[PDB]
Amino acid sequence: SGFRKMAFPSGKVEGCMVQVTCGTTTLNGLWLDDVVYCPRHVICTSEDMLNPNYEDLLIRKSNHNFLVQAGNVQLRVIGHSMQNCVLKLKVDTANPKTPKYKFVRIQPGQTFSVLACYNGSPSGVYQCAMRPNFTIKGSFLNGSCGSVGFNIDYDCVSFCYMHHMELPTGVHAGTDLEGNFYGPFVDRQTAQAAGTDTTITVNVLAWLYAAVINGDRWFLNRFTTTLNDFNLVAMKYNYEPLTQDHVDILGPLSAQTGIAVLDMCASLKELLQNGMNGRTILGSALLEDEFTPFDVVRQCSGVT
Amino acid sequence: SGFRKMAFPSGKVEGCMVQVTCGTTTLNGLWLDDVVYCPRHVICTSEDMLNPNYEDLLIRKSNHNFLVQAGNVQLRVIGHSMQNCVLKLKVDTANPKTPKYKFVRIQPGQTFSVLACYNGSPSGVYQCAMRPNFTIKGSFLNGSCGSVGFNIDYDCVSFCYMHHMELPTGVHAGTDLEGNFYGPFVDRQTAQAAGTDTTITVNVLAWLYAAVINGDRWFLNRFTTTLNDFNLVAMKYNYEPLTQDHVDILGPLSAQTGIAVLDMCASLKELLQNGMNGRTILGSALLEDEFTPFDVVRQCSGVT
Numbered sequence: 261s262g263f264r265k266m267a268f269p270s271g272k273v274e275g276c277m278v279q280v281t282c283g284t285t286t287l288n289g290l291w292l293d294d295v296v297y298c299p300r301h302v303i304c305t306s307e308d309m310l311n312p313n314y315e316d317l318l319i320r321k322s323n324h325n326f327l328v329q330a331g332n333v334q335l336r337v338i339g340h341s342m343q344n345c346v347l348k349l350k351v352d353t354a355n356p357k358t359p360k361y362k363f364v365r366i367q368p369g370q371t372f373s374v375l376a377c378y379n380g381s382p383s384g385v386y387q388c389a390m391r392p393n394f395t396i397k398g399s400f401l402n403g404s405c406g407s408v409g410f411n412i413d414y415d416c417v418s419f420c421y422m423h424h425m426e427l428p429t430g431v432h433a434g435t436d437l438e439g440n441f442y443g444p445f446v447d448r449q450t451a452q453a454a455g456t457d458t459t460i461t462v463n464v465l466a467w468l469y470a471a472v473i474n475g476d477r478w479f480l481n482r483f484t485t486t487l488n489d490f491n492l493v494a495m496k497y498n499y500e501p502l503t504q505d506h507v508d509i510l511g512p513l514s515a516q517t518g519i520a521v522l523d524m525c526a527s528l529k530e531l532l533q534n535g536m537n538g539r540t541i542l543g544s545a546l547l548e549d550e551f552t553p554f555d556v557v558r559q560c561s562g563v564t
Numbered sequence: 565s566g567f568r569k570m571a572f573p574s575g576k577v578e579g580c581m582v583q584v585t586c587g588t589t590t591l592n593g594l595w596l597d598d599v600v601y602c603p604r605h606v607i608c609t610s611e612d613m614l615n616p617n618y619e620d621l622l623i624r625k626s627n628h629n630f631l632v633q634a635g636n637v638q639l640r641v642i643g644h645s646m647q648n649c650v651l652k653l654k655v656d657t658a659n660p661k662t663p664k665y666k667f668v669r670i671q672p673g674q675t676f677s678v679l680a681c682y683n684g685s686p687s688g689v690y691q692c693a694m695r696p697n698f699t700i701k702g703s704f705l706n707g708s709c710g711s712v713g714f715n716i717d718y719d720c721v722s723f724c725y726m727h728h729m730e731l732p733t734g735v736h737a738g739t740d741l742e743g744n745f746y747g748p749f750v751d752r753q754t755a756q757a758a759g760t761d762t763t764i765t766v767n768v769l770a771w772l773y774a775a776v777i778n779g780d781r782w783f784l785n786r787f788t789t790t791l792n793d794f795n796l797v798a799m800k801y802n803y804e805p806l807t808q809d810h811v812d813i814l815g816p817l818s819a820q821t822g823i824a825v826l827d828m829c830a831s832l833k834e835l836l837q838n839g840m841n842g843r844t845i846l847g848s849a850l851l852e853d854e855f856t857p858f859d860v861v862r863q864c865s866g867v868t
């Protein structure tokens with residue numbers, strides 16, 4: 261019992277963190293096999309960040325200009341290349357601590373753990389969601405660039421995010437491990453619109469099932485709804501429209517609790533229309549959307 | 565910017581987790597140097613847990629009865645002893661992955677990270693507080709016993725908690741690494757009173773300073789208060805009384821923001837008396853008490 265915003269154990273990722281320095285800029289790198297992945301803005305100075313010509317900036321750099329330190333030992337750089345917004349620094353030694361890994365591009369609404377790092381050293385780990393507007397509400401300061409987001413399946417780390425930038429609104433933007441930004445963002449010091457965010461409806465429903473499993477049941481009502489009726493309410497409250505694909509992923513939780521998905525939607529409809537009335541659900545006074553149905557099943561069953 | 569319920573990177577602790585089996589019971593162990601630490605209820609069967617005579621139960625066990633597996637390899641047990649509610653299993657090999665470590669008994673109101681484990685394997689990491697009533701609101705299922713709580717200072721892991729038991733209320737009880745329970749709890753299958761909990765006032769104030777630092781300022785008012793006036797309000801709302809020791813630890817945050825501690829107490833007084841009025845602070849609709857002033861300073865400065 262109990263339900264927490266749990267992150268994956270970060271050990272496999274800690275072993276990949278390195279410090280990358282180029283000129284006067286230092287940020288975090290990810291050492292997997294014989295390649296170091298890091299945000300390409302490592303080659304920029306503050307004056308360059310206004311409107312950087314990354315191709316031109318990288319042309320003035322040689323392998324010896326990229327200083328890569330793993331803990332206290334220095335890595336020899338034998339190749340460099342830019343893929344989208346990431347730099348891939350080929351090194352002469354494969355990381356002995358490389359876990360089994362994949363590079364994945366997550367969908368918005370999916371969750372992942374972030375190992376926040378500074379100067380190649382890990383400071384903390386937290387769970388978060390890729391927002392529907394492709395931003396993340398993280399905790400990052402200057403120097404945290406290159407920190408990565410990931411998921412773990414048994415022994416395989418699926419890297420999904422590399423941190424690049426803080427928007428003027430204090431929300432965070434980044435790329436997949438191929439250097440492609442999530443969302444419309446560009447790696448420049450310019451104000452950029454994140455766009456309208458929504459609440460991740462399937463995740464709130466999953467968290468409501470987690471609450472019922474763990475004893476918080478006060479919000480269960482004598483009502484039911486339909487997908488169309490619920491979606492009218494979701495539209496009014498800036499919630500993502502629920503589809504049959506969402507209903508299908510909630511199947512395991514509906515089977516476990518015996519509460520039909522549309523019955524749980526009617527509880528969520530009443531919570532949206534009436535509020536919490538000063539009450540709480542799983543220690544929260546708002547509807548939590550950072551747990552996927554998969555996360556709820558994993559945490560509620562103790563998957564390692 | 566951004567403020568998250570961040571846990572320490574769990575890598576150093578993952579490397580210490582082992583599986584301990586005795587008879588039919590399997591739980592988690594902590595392998596540091598040549599000793600495996602685990603909850604003493606590993607020697608019990610379900611029938612024994614009603615009123616166990618641990619001394620008598622352990623007398624029927626020999627070194628060969630404790631099966632300790634680190635990953636996939638088996639550890640040879642050359643000694644066993646009971647210290648309070650923990651068993652210390654001497655093994656013939658020192659853990660090569662033993663980090664620099666200490667055993668500490670935390671004070672209530674202090675926070676720590678938990679690496680939840682099942683069968684010696686890590687499932688997740690989360691940050692939590694030792695409640696004023698010496699319980700923890702964790703996320704643990706059967707088999708999670710032996711999972712540990714810890715803090716990290718540079719390269720040193722300070723183990724503070726070992727998970728033992730789930731109370732009938734769904735809250736969690738455990739011991740320090742010398743086997744001494746936090747609180748009045750005994751390791752028996754009997755209903756046990758946790759006692760009145762309170763909100764950790766110094767932590768809420770620290771989190772209010774974190775909110776101001778990160779931009780959430782709506783709760784700042786034109787008022788001030790005194791320790792005695794604030795404590796009358798704290799008493800009414802089941803908050804711990806604030807002392808000058810608490811004011812002193814909030815000094816760094818008061819200096820950073822320029823908001824006097826008693827001025828921040830007046831904001832907290834008004835939030836307690838008026839509520840949030842449907843608004844949020846750092847993504848929360850309630851007053852958060854799981855961040856110490858130290859945690860706020862660490863997260864807001866990027867300490868690794």
Ligand SMILES: Cc1ccncc1NC(=O)[C@H](CO)c1cccc(Cl)c1
Pocket residue numbers: 301309400401402403404405424425426427446447448449450565
């Ligand atoms: C300062 C900060 C805070 C949190 N997370 C990250 C950062 N990083 C930034 O915003 C840097 C400048 O430091 C940057 C500016 C413009 C474009 C890009 Cl790709 C990166």
Ligand SMILES: Cc1ccncc1NC(=O)[C@H](CO)c1cccc(Cl)c1
Pocket residue numbers: 261605613704705706707708709728729730731750751752753754
């Ligand atoms: C079942 C569970 C769930 C979460 N965390 C832990 C557990 N553990 C327990 O309560 C076990 C029985 O499984 C136990 C019963 C009585 C005393 C003690 Cl010390 C331990």
